[PDB]
Design a protein around this ligand. Sequence first.
Ligand code: 9YO
Ligand code: CL
Ligand code: CL
Length: 224
Amino acid sequence: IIDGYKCKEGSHPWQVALLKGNQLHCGGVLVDKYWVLTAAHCKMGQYQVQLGSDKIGDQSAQKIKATKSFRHPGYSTKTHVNDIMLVRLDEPVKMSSKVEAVQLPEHCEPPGTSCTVSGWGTTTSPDVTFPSDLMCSDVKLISSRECKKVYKDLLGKTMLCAGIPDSKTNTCNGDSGGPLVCNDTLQGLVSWGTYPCGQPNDPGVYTQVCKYKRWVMETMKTHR
Ligand SMILES: CC1=N[C@H](c2cn(S(=O)(=O)c3ccccc3Cl)c3ccc(C)cc23)CN1
Ligand SMILES: [Cl-]
Ligand SMILES: [Cl-]
């Protein structure tokens, strides 16, 4: 997170870190005791999933292994559309003041809506500096039409842009797969942006979660 702030204790109980061994690979977001949502580009054969702390690599935090991923079948490695994935935990997490699922969206929030994105990604770019504390950036949704002035044909119908005009505050490497929360619902998953990160008037690009309600619920079903 470029030009962010340390997230307030307890305000992000759904954030998880997806670790490759012990090292940060991506962010993700708890949606259920058994399920994490993240970007498709974050996929690995297995993960260690850190829950219930703002500190990355916290030795006191719960760590649950995960080895089953469920990408959206339309995910593209070329155009980056459908960059969304569910990951099933080996064991269920216990909920607490530090651990809680985010609320999945019922509707799509419109342009101009205030949001916050969180992650342990680098706070500088292109020289990287990885923080301990979970960082936050406050950003607003940008309409397609405005976002297309920057990204043109690269933007797909289910991508969602956010930033602040003339500000550097934004996502960066390691933030991938983390939550963009607006008006108390998950509206985005961190997907991509421009590199180097945190150039004013280069919006962050997210997967637009409200366009995948059916898929998320179907894929997670525990009954008929
Ligand atoms: C979908 C996908 N995201 C991955 C990636 C990460 N970066 S990034 O430089 O680290 C980045 C810059 C700005 C904001 C957020 C981020 Cl994560 C990208 C920049 C541009 C593009 C096409 C992809 C990525 C690789 N694949
Ligand atoms: Cl990939
Ligand atoms: Cl998959």
